[PDB]
Scaffold this active site. Structure first.
Site, PDB file in Angstrom:
ATOM      1  N   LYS A 169       5.927  -1.424   7.673  1.00  0.00           N
ATOM      2  CA  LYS A 169       6.930  -0.771   6.844  1.00  0.00           C
ATOM      3  C   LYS A 169       8.202  -1.605   6.858  1.00  0.00           C
ATOM      4  O   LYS A 169       8.629  -2.083   7.914  1.00  0.00           O
ATOM      5  CB  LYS A 169       7.180   0.686   7.261  1.00  0.00           C
ATOM      6  CG  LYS A 169       8.331   1.344   6.514  1.00  0.00           C
ATOM      7  CD  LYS A 169       8.446   2.837   6.761  1.00  0.00           C
ATOM      8  CE  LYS A 169       7.430   3.710   6.037  1.00  0.00           C
ATOM      9  NZ  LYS A 169       7.770   5.164   6.053  1.00  0.00           N
ATOM     10  N   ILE A 215       0.813  -1.220   0.000  1.00  0.00           N
ATOM     11  CA  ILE A 215       0.000   0.000   0.000  1.00  0.00           C
ATOM     12  C   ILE A 215       0.853   1.281   0.000  1.00  0.00           C
ATOM     13  O   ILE A 215       0.374   2.360   0.356  1.00  0.00           O
ATOM     14  CB  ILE A 215      -1.035  -0.012   1.150  1.00  0.00           C
ATOM     15  CG1 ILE A 215      -0.340  -0.083   2.493  1.00  0.00           C
ATOM     16  CG2 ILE A 215      -2.009  -1.179   1.009  1.00  0.00           C
ATOM     17  CD1 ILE A 215      -1.200   0.225   3.635  1.00  0.00           C
ATOM     18  N   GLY A 216       2.107   1.168  -0.402  1.00  0.00           N
ATOM     19  CA  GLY A 216       3.034   2.290  -0.437  1.00  0.00           C
ATOM     20  C   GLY A 216       4.427   1.758  -0.675  1.00  0.00           C
ATOM     21  O   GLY A 216       4.796   0.748  -0.095  1.00  0.00           O
ATOM     22  N   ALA A 261      11.819   4.986  -1.659  1.00  0.00           N
ATOM     23  CA  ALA A 261      13.273   4.824  -1.797  1.00  0.00           C
ATOM     24  C   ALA A 261      13.816   3.871  -0.694  1.00  0.00           C
ATOM     25  O   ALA A 261      14.577   2.935  -0.967  1.00  0.00           O
ATOM     26  CB  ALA A 261      13.946   6.200  -1.729  1.00  0.00           C
ATOM     27  N   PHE A 262      13.334   4.104   0.536  1.00  0.00           N
ATOM     28  CA  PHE A 262      13.583   3.408   1.798  1.00  0.00           C
ATOM     29  C   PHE A 262      13.232   1.898   1.709  1.00  0.00           C
ATOM     30  O   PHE A 262      14.086   1.034   1.917  1.00  0.00           O
ATOM     31  CB  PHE A 262      12.759   4.115   2.922  1.00  0.00           C
ATOM     32  CG  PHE A 262      11.344   4.525   2.535  1.00  0.00           C
ATOM     33  CD1 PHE A 262      11.101   5.732   1.899  1.00  0.00           C
ATOM     34  CD2 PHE A 262      10.266   3.705   2.814  1.00  0.00           C
ATOM     35  CE1 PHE A 262       9.814   6.093   1.531  1.00  0.00           C
ATOM     36  CE2 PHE A 262       8.991   4.056   2.418  1.00  0.00           C
ATOM     37  CZ  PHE A 262       8.773   5.248   1.777  1.00  0.00           C
ATOM     38  N   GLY A 263      11.986   1.634   1.340  1.00  0.00           N
ATOM     39  CA  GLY A 263      11.352   0.335   1.226  1.00  0.00           C
ATOM     40  C   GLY A 263       9.861   0.514   0.993  1.00  0.00           C
ATOM     41  O   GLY A 263       9.421   1.551   0.492  1.00  0.00           O
ATOM     42  N   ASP A 305       8.351  17.261   9.182  1.00  0.00           N
ATOM     43  CA  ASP A 305       7.918  17.012   7.809  1.00  0.00           C
ATOM     44  C   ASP A 305       6.417  16.785   7.741  1.00  0.00           C
ATOM     45  O   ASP A 305       5.957  15.786   7.190  1.00  0.00           O
ATOM     46  CB  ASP A 305       8.714  15.833   7.213  1.00  0.00           C
ATOM     47  CG  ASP A 305       8.515  15.563   5.729  1.00  0.00           C
ATOM     48  OD1 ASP A 305       8.385  16.525   4.969  1.00  0.00           O
ATOM     49  OD2 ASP A 305       8.495  14.379   5.338  1.00  0.00           O
TER      50      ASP A 305
END
Ligand SMILES: O=C(Cc1ccc(-c2n[nH]c(=O)c3ccccc23)cc1)N1CCc2ccccc21
Length: 384
Positions: free
Chosen positions: A98, A75-76, A79-81, A188
Protein backbone atom coordinates in the site's frame (compact mmCIF):
# COMPACT_ATOMS: atom_id res chain seq x y z
CA UNK A 1 30.47 1.89 29.47
CA UNK A 2 27.83 0.35 31.83
CA UNK A 3 25.41 3.27 31.14
CA UNK A 4 26.44 3.08 27.43
CA UNK A 5 25.50 -0.62 27.33
CA UNK A 6 22.04 0.32 28.79
CA UNK A 7 21.65 3.11 26.16
CA UNK A 8 22.94 0.86 23.31
CA UNK A 9 20.19 -1.64 24.39
CA UNK A 10 17.22 0.75 23.89
CA UNK A 11 18.47 1.59 20.39
CA UNK A 12 18.82 -2.14 19.61
CA UNK A 13 15.27 -2.97 20.87
CA UNK A 14 13.08 -2.78 17.72
CA UNK A 15 10.00 -1.97 19.81
CA UNK A 16 11.66 1.22 21.22
CA UNK A 17 10.53 4.80 20.39
CA UNK A 18 14.16 5.71 19.57
CA UNK A 19 15.81 2.79 17.73
CA UNK A 20 18.01 2.48 14.53
CA UNK A 21 14.99 2.85 12.18
CA UNK A 22 13.61 5.82 14.17
CA UNK A 23 17.02 7.50 14.34
CA UNK A 24 17.47 7.05 10.60
CA UNK A 25 13.90 8.38 10.06
CA UNK A 26 14.81 11.46 12.14
CA UNK A 27 17.92 12.23 10.06
CA UNK A 28 16.11 11.64 6.72
CA UNK A 29 13.16 13.88 7.75
CA UNK A 30 15.60 16.60 9.01
CA UNK A 31 17.42 16.62 5.64
CA UNK A 32 14.12 16.65 3.66
CA UNK A 33 12.48 19.41 5.75
CA UNK A 34 15.53 21.68 5.38
CA UNK A 35 16.46 21.13 1.69
CA UNK A 36 14.62 24.17 0.34
CA UNK A 37 16.46 27.19 -1.13
CA UNK A 38 14.48 29.67 1.05
CA UNK A 39 15.71 27.80 4.16
CA UNK A 40 19.22 27.27 2.71
CA UNK A 41 19.87 31.04 3.14
CA UNK A 42 20.53 30.24 6.87
CA UNK A 43 24.22 29.21 7.17
CA UNK A 44 23.47 26.66 9.96
CA UNK A 45 21.01 24.84 7.65
CA UNK A 46 23.11 25.14 4.47
CA UNK A 47 26.26 23.80 6.19
CA UNK A 48 24.43 20.87 7.91
CA UNK A 49 22.86 19.93 4.58
CA UNK A 50 26.26 20.10 2.85
CA UNK A 51 27.98 17.77 5.31
CA UNK A 52 25.17 15.21 5.53
CA UNK A 53 23.92 15.44 1.90
CA UNK A 54 26.20 12.74 0.44
CA UNK A 55 25.95 10.34 3.39
CA UNK A 56 22.11 10.63 3.60
CA UNK A 57 22.08 9.59 -0.12
CA UNK A 58 24.36 6.54 0.61
CA UNK A 59 22.15 5.53 3.61
CA UNK A 60 18.94 5.90 1.54
CA UNK A 61 20.38 3.42 -0.99
CA UNK A 62 21.13 0.71 1.58
CA UNK A 63 17.76 1.03 3.39
CA UNK A 64 14.69 -0.69 1.90
CA UNK A 65 13.20 1.45 -0.88
CA UNK A 66 10.40 1.32 -3.47
CA UNK A 67 12.98 0.43 -6.19
CA UNK A 68 13.73 -2.92 -4.41
CA UNK A 69 10.28 -4.01 -5.65
CA UNK A 70 8.91 -4.82 -9.05
CA UNK A 71 5.38 -3.45 -9.63
CA UNK A 72 3.30 -6.27 -11.13
CA UNK A 73 -0.03 -4.36 -11.19
CA UNK A 74 -2.37 -2.07 -9.24
CA UNK A 75 -4.95 -4.19 -7.31
CA UNK A 76 -6.75 -1.33 -5.50
CA UNK A 77 -6.74 2.48 -5.69
CA UNK A 78 -8.31 5.00 -3.36
CA UNK A 79 -8.30 8.57 -1.96
CA UNK A 80 -5.26 7.71 0.28
CA UNK A 81 -3.19 6.01 -2.47
CA UNK A 82 -3.03 2.61 -4.17
CA UNK A 83 -2.22 -1.06 -3.43
CA UNK A 84 0.22 -2.74 -5.79
CA UNK A 85 0.91 -6.39 -6.35
CA UNK A 86 4.70 -6.31 -6.08
CA UNK A 87 7.62 -8.73 -6.16
CA UNK A 88 10.74 -8.16 -4.02
CA UNK A 89 13.53 -8.29 -6.66
CA UNK A 90 16.12 -10.09 -4.47
CA UNK A 91 13.96 -12.62 -2.60
CA UNK A 92 11.57 -13.09 -5.59
CA UNK A 93 8.62 -13.23 -3.12
CA UNK A 94 5.34 -11.51 -4.00
CA UNK A 95 3.67 -9.05 -1.57
CA UNK A 96 0.84 -6.47 -1.52
CA UNK A 97 2.20 -2.91 -1.09
CA UNK A 98 0.00 0.00 0.00
CA UNK A 99 1.27 3.44 -0.95
CA UNK A 100 -0.12 6.26 1.19
CA UNK A 101 0.34 9.86 0.09
CA UNK A 102 2.13 11.65 2.94
CA UNK A 103 0.36 14.89 1.90
CA UNK A 104 -3.14 13.35 2.05
CA UNK A 105 -2.17 11.45 5.24
CA UNK A 106 -1.23 14.67 7.08
CA UNK A 107 -4.78 16.06 6.27
CA UNK A 108 -6.51 13.68 8.80
CA UNK A 109 -0.27 11.65 15.15
CA UNK A 110 1.57 8.23 15.70
CA UNK A 111 -1.10 6.49 13.60
CA UNK A 112 0.92 3.26 13.20
CA UNK A 113 0.62 2.43 16.94
CA UNK A 114 -2.14 -0.16 16.29
CA UNK A 115 -0.34 -1.41 13.11
CA UNK A 116 2.68 -2.19 15.36
CA UNK A 117 0.47 -3.94 18.01
CA UNK A 118 -1.14 -6.09 15.31
CA UNK A 119 2.21 -6.76 13.57
CA UNK A 120 3.73 -7.98 16.84
CA UNK A 121 0.65 -10.07 17.81
CA UNK A 122 1.08 -11.99 14.51
CA UNK A 123 -2.45 -13.47 14.44
CA UNK A 124 -3.30 -16.00 11.71
CA UNK A 125 -6.60 -14.01 11.39
CA UNK A 126 -5.09 -10.60 10.57
CA UNK A 127 -3.25 -9.65 7.30
CA UNK A 128 0.47 -9.48 8.21
CA UNK A 129 2.82 -6.47 7.97
CA UNK A 130 6.29 -7.45 6.85
CA UNK A 131 8.00 -4.05 6.27
CA UNK A 132 7.12 -0.35 6.19
CA UNK A 133 9.30 2.34 4.71
CA UNK A 134 8.95 5.90 3.35
CA UNK A 135 10.25 8.37 0.78
CA UNK A 136 9.61 12.18 0.49
CA UNK A 137 6.16 11.66 -1.06
CA UNK A 138 4.91 8.22 0.03
CA UNK A 139 4.44 5.92 3.00
CA UNK A 140 4.84 2.23 2.07
CA UNK A 141 3.39 -0.80 3.74
CA UNK A 142 4.46 -4.27 2.57
CA UNK A 143 1.69 -6.73 3.52
CA UNK A 144 1.03 -10.41 2.82
CA UNK A 145 -0.70 -10.75 -0.51
CA UNK A 146 -4.22 -12.25 -0.16
CA UNK A 147 -4.74 -13.79 -3.61
CA UNK A 148 -8.28 -14.95 -2.90
CA UNK A 149 -9.58 -11.36 -3.10
CA UNK A 150 -12.02 -9.66 -0.72
CA UNK A 151 -15.58 -10.68 0.26
CA UNK A 152 -17.04 -7.92 -2.01
CA UNK A 153 -15.64 -9.99 -4.94
CA UNK A 154 -16.79 -13.34 -3.40
CA UNK A 155 -20.32 -11.98 -2.85
CA UNK A 156 -20.51 -10.51 -6.38
CA UNK A 157 -19.42 -13.87 -7.92
CA UNK A 158 -21.40 -16.35 -5.76
CA UNK A 159 -24.85 -17.03 -4.26
CA UNK A 160 -23.75 -17.72 -0.67
CA UNK A 161 -25.36 -20.79 1.00
CA UNK A 162 -25.77 -21.01 4.79
CA UNK A 163 -22.86 -23.55 4.97
CA UNK A 164 -20.56 -20.91 3.45
CA UNK A 165 -21.94 -17.94 5.49
CA UNK A 166 -21.69 -20.12 8.64
CA UNK A 167 -17.87 -20.49 7.86
CA UNK A 168 -16.99 -16.86 6.91
CA UNK A 169 -19.00 -15.55 9.86
CA UNK A 170 -17.15 -17.91 12.22
CA UNK A 171 -13.75 -16.85 10.75
CA UNK A 172 -14.70 -13.12 11.07
CA UNK A 173 -15.83 -13.90 14.65
CA UNK A 174 -12.40 -15.45 15.50
CA UNK A 175 -10.54 -12.58 13.77
CA UNK A 176 -12.55 -10.04 15.80
CA UNK A 177 -11.90 -12.02 19.02
CA UNK A 178 -8.13 -11.80 18.17
CA UNK A 179 -8.29 -8.01 17.56
CA UNK A 180 -10.27 -7.36 20.76
CA UNK A 181 -7.80 -9.55 22.72
CA UNK A 182 -4.95 -7.26 21.49
CA UNK A 183 -6.79 -4.37 23.27
CA UNK A 184 -8.17 -3.12 19.96
CA UNK A 185 -11.41 -2.20 18.20
CA UNK A 186 -11.37 -2.64 14.44
CA UNK A 187 -14.08 0.04 13.88
CA UNK A 188 -14.65 -0.50 10.17
CA UNK A 189 -15.37 -4.20 9.65
CA UNK A 190 -16.72 -4.55 6.05
CA UNK A 191 -16.15 -6.99 3.09
CA UNK A 192 -13.41 -4.73 1.62
CA UNK A 193 -11.40 -5.48 4.86
CA UNK A 194 -12.25 -9.21 4.71
CA UNK A 195 -9.47 -10.71 2.61
CA UNK A 196 -9.05 -14.35 1.54
CA UNK A 197 -5.64 -16.02 1.65
CA UNK A 198 -3.92 -18.49 -0.76
CA UNK A 199 -6.41 -21.27 0.53
CA UNK A 200 -9.66 -19.30 0.85
CA UNK A 201 -9.37 -18.62 4.58
CA UNK A 202 -10.41 -15.16 5.86
CA UNK A 203 -8.17 -12.55 7.51
CA UNK A 204 -9.21 -9.07 8.66
CA UNK A 205 -7.24 -6.14 7.33
CA UNK A 206 -6.89 -2.76 9.07
CA UNK A 207 -6.98 0.11 6.55
CA UNK A 208 -6.32 2.79 9.22
CA UNK A 209 -9.35 2.44 11.50
CA UNK A 210 -7.99 0.19 14.34
CA UNK A 211 -7.89 1.84 17.72
CA UNK A 212 -6.42 0.95 21.14
CA UNK A 213 -9.13 0.75 23.88
CA UNK A 214 -8.67 2.92 26.98
CA UNK A 215 -8.59 1.53 30.61
CA UNK A 216 -12.47 1.30 30.44
CA UNK A 217 -12.41 -0.64 27.10
CA UNK A 218 -13.69 2.27 24.97
CA UNK A 219 -12.55 4.42 21.96
CA UNK A 220 -13.37 7.88 20.20
CA UNK A 221 -13.02 9.66 16.63
CA UNK A 222 -13.28 8.50 9.60
CA UNK A 223 -16.45 6.45 8.88
CA UNK A 224 -16.52 6.60 5.09
CA UNK A 225 -19.12 4.24 3.64
CA UNK A 226 -21.58 3.47 6.42
CA UNK A 227 -23.54 0.29 5.39
CA UNK A 228 -21.72 -1.78 8.09
CA UNK A 229 -21.35 0.89 10.81
CA UNK A 230 -23.37 0.56 14.05
CA UNK A 231 -25.73 3.35 15.28
CA UNK A 232 -23.43 4.04 18.27
CA UNK A 233 -20.44 4.70 15.95
CA UNK A 234 -22.58 7.02 13.69
CA UNK A 235 -23.97 8.89 16.75
CA UNK A 236 -20.43 9.42 18.13
CA UNK A 237 -19.20 11.41 15.07
CA UNK A 238 -19.07 14.70 18.49
CA UNK A 239 -16.29 12.84 20.41
CA UNK A 240 -18.54 9.99 21.61
CA UNK A 241 -17.47 6.71 23.28
CA UNK A 242 -18.21 3.14 22.15
CA UNK A 243 -16.82 -0.36 22.85
CA UNK A 244 -15.93 -3.59 21.02
CA UNK A 245 -19.66 -4.40 20.54
CA UNK A 246 -19.66 -1.91 17.58
CA UNK A 247 -17.69 -4.60 15.63
CA UNK A 248 -20.36 -7.29 16.36
CA UNK A 249 -22.97 -5.05 14.62
CA UNK A 250 -20.88 -5.32 11.44
CA UNK A 251 -20.89 -9.17 11.81
CA UNK A 252 -24.72 -9.08 11.69
CA UNK A 253 -24.59 -6.73 8.63
CA UNK A 254 -22.17 -9.19 7.02
CA UNK A 255 -24.31 -12.30 7.65
CA UNK A 256 -27.28 -10.41 6.16
CA UNK A 257 -25.44 -9.33 2.98
CA UNK A 258 -24.20 -12.96 2.48
CA UNK A 259 -27.58 -14.65 2.80
CA UNK A 260 -29.78 -11.89 1.35
CA UNK A 261 -27.52 -10.35 -1.28
CA UNK A 262 -28.02 -6.69 -0.29
CA UNK A 263 -27.03 -4.74 2.87
CA UNK A 264 -29.88 -4.53 5.46
CA UNK A 265 -29.86 -0.72 5.53
CA UNK A 266 -29.19 -0.04 1.81
CA UNK A 267 -30.35 3.19 0.17
CA UNK A 268 -29.88 5.17 -3.10
CA UNK A 269 -28.16 7.88 -0.96
CA UNK A 270 -25.65 8.01 1.92
CA UNK A 271 -28.19 10.03 3.98
CA UNK A 272 -30.77 7.29 3.46
CA UNK A 273 -28.22 4.65 4.55
CA UNK A 274 -27.43 6.72 7.67
CA UNK A 275 -31.17 7.15 8.34
CA UNK A 276 -32.10 3.47 7.82
CA UNK A 277 -29.25 2.56 10.26
CA UNK A 278 -30.45 4.97 12.96
CA UNK A 279 -34.08 3.72 12.53
CA UNK A 280 -32.85 0.08 12.51
CA UNK A 281 -35.78 -0.97 14.77
CA UNK A 282 -38.25 -0.09 11.96
CA UNK A 283 -36.03 -0.50 8.85
CA UNK A 284 -34.60 -3.97 9.50
CA UNK A 285 -36.52 -6.49 7.39
CA UNK A 286 -35.86 -9.67 5.54
CA UNK A 287 -37.42 -10.07 2.05
CA UNK A 288 -40.19 -12.70 1.64
CA UNK A 289 -38.49 -14.13 -1.51
CA UNK A 290 -35.22 -14.63 0.45
CA UNK A 291 -35.53 -17.98 2.29
CA UNK A 292 -33.46 -17.76 5.53
CA UNK A 293 -33.27 -20.28 8.43
CA UNK A 294 -34.76 -19.42 11.86
CA UNK A 295 -31.26 -19.46 13.47
CA UNK A 296 -29.76 -17.31 10.69
CA UNK A 297 -32.53 -14.67 11.13
CA UNK A 298 -32.11 -14.96 14.93
CA UNK A 299 -28.31 -14.38 14.78
CA UNK A 300 -28.60 -11.41 12.37
CA UNK A 301 -31.16 -9.86 14.76
CA UNK A 302 -29.17 -10.60 17.93
CA UNK A 303 -26.29 -8.52 16.41
CA UNK A 304 -28.46 -5.87 14.74
CA UNK A 305 -29.94 -4.52 18.02
CA UNK A 306 -28.98 -1.70 20.47
CA UNK A 307 -25.50 -2.00 22.05
CA UNK A 308 -27.08 -2.58 25.52
CA UNK A 309 -28.79 -5.78 24.43
CA UNK A 310 -26.48 -6.80 21.43
CA UNK A 311 -24.86 -10.30 21.20
CA UNK A 312 -21.18 -10.28 22.16
CA UNK A 313 -21.70 -7.85 25.11
CA UNK A 314 -21.13 -10.80 27.51
CA UNK A 315 -18.28 -12.24 25.43
CA UNK A 316 -17.40 -14.40 22.42
CA UNK A 317 -18.61 -17.65 24.09
CA UNK A 318 -22.32 -16.71 23.60
CA UNK A 319 -21.65 -15.99 19.88
CA UNK A 320 -19.93 -19.40 19.48
CA UNK A 321 -22.77 -21.08 21.41
CA UNK A 322 -25.41 -19.64 19.02
CA UNK A 323 -27.26 -22.50 17.26
CA UNK A 324 -26.58 -21.01 13.77
CA UNK A 325 -22.94 -22.28 14.19
CA UNK A 326 -24.07 -25.91 14.71
CA UNK A 327 -22.34 -27.84 11.89
CA UNK A 328 -20.69 -31.12 10.77
CA UNK A 329 -17.70 -29.43 9.00
CA UNK A 330 -15.60 -27.57 11.65
CA UNK A 331 -14.89 -26.71 15.29
CA UNK A 332 -14.11 -23.33 16.86
CA UNK A 333 -10.58 -24.69 17.66
CA UNK A 334 -9.80 -26.14 14.18
CA UNK A 335 -11.85 -24.09 11.65
CA UNK A 336 -8.69 -22.63 10.01
CA UNK A 337 -7.34 -26.09 9.16
CA UNK A 338 -10.66 -27.28 7.61
CA UNK A 339 -11.61 -27.13 3.90
CA UNK A 340 -12.56 -23.61 2.86
CA UNK A 341 -15.79 -23.38 0.81
CA UNK A 342 -14.23 -21.36 -2.01
CA UNK A 343 -10.75 -22.54 -2.92
CA UNK A 344 -8.86 -20.19 -5.27
CA UNK A 345 -7.24 -21.58 -8.45
CA UNK A 346 -3.93 -19.70 -8.70
CA UNK A 347 -1.75 -20.59 -11.73
CA UNK A 348 1.13 -18.29 -10.68
CA UNK A 349 2.26 -16.34 -7.56
CA UNK A 350 1.14 -13.13 -9.43
CA UNK A 351 -2.34 -14.50 -10.39
CA UNK A 352 -4.67 -11.60 -9.54
CA UNK A 353 -7.88 -13.06 -11.06
CA UNK A 354 -9.87 -12.37 -7.86
CA UNK A 355 -9.10 -8.65 -8.18
CA UNK A 356 -10.91 -6.19 -10.44
CA UNK A 357 -8.63 -4.47 -13.00
CA UNK A 358 -7.54 -0.80 -12.38
CA UNK A 359 -4.26 -0.21 -14.51
CA UNK A 360 -4.25 3.79 -14.55
CA UNK A 361 -0.78 12.89 -7.63
CA UNK A 362 -0.66 15.87 -5.20
CA UNK A 363 2.44 16.65 -3.05
CA UNK A 364 3.46 19.07 -0.16
CA UNK A 365 3.90 22.72 -1.23
CA UNK A 366 7.50 24.15 -1.09
CA UNK A 367 7.72 26.09 2.19
CA UNK A 368 9.20 29.54 2.88
CA UNK A 369 9.92 28.87 6.60
CA UNK A 370 10.59 25.51 8.37
CA UNK A 371 7.25 23.66 8.70
CA UNK A 372 8.41 20.07 9.40
CA UNK A 373 6.07 18.14 7.11
CA UNK A 374 8.16 14.95 7.48
CA UNK A 375 8.26 15.09 11.31
CA UNK A 376 4.94 13.18 11.86
CA UNK A 377 6.35 10.10 10.09
CA UNK A 378 9.49 9.56 12.27
CA UNK A 379 9.25 5.98 13.55
CA UNK A 380 6.98 4.75 10.72
CA UNK A 381 9.86 2.70 9.18
CA UNK A 382 9.53 -0.96 10.29
CA UNK A 383 12.03 -3.75 9.68
CA UNK A 384 11.89 -7.34 10.96
O1 LIG B 1 -4.11 -0.06 4.94
C1 LIG B 1 -3.33 -0.34 5.84
C2 LIG B 1 -2.58 -1.66 5.88
C3 LIG B 1 -2.97 -2.63 4.79
C4 LIG B 1 -3.52 -3.86 5.13
C5 LIG B 1 -3.78 -4.82 4.17
C6 LIG B 1 -3.49 -4.57 2.83
C7 LIG B 1 -3.66 -5.64 1.81
N1 LIG B 1 -3.01 -6.75 2.05
N2 LIG B 1 -3.08 -7.77 1.11
C8 LIG B 1 -3.76 -7.75 -0.06
O2 LIG B 1 -3.74 -8.72 -0.81
C9 LIG B 1 -4.51 -6.50 -0.33
C10 LIG B 1 -5.26 -6.36 -1.49
C11 LIG B 1 -5.95 -5.18 -1.72
C12 LIG B 1 -5.90 -4.15 -0.81
C13 LIG B 1 -5.16 -4.28 0.36
C14 LIG B 1 -4.46 -5.45 0.61
C15 LIG B 1 -2.97 -3.33 2.48
C16 LIG B 1 -2.71 -2.37 3.45
N3 LIG B 1 -3.07 0.51 6.87
C17 LIG B 1 -2.55 0.03 8.18
C18 LIG B 1 -2.09 1.29 8.91
C19 LIG B 1 -2.70 2.41 8.10
C20 LIG B 1 -2.78 3.77 8.36
C21 LIG B 1 -3.41 4.60 7.46
C22 LIG B 1 -3.97 4.09 6.30
C23 LIG B 1 -3.90 2.74 6.02
C24 LIG B 1 -3.26 1.90 6.93
Amino acid sequence: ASRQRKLEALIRDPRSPINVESLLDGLNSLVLDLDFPALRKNKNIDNFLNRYEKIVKKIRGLQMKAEDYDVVKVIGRGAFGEVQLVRHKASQKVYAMKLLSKFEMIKRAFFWEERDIMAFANSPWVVQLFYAFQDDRYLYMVMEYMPGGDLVNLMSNYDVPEKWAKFYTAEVVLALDAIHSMGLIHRDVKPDNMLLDKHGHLKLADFGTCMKMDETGMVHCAVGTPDYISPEVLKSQGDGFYGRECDWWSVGVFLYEMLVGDTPFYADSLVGTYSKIMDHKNSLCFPEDAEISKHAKNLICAFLTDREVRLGRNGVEEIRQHPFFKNDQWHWDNIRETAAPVVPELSSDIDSSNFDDIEDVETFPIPKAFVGNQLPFIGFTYYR
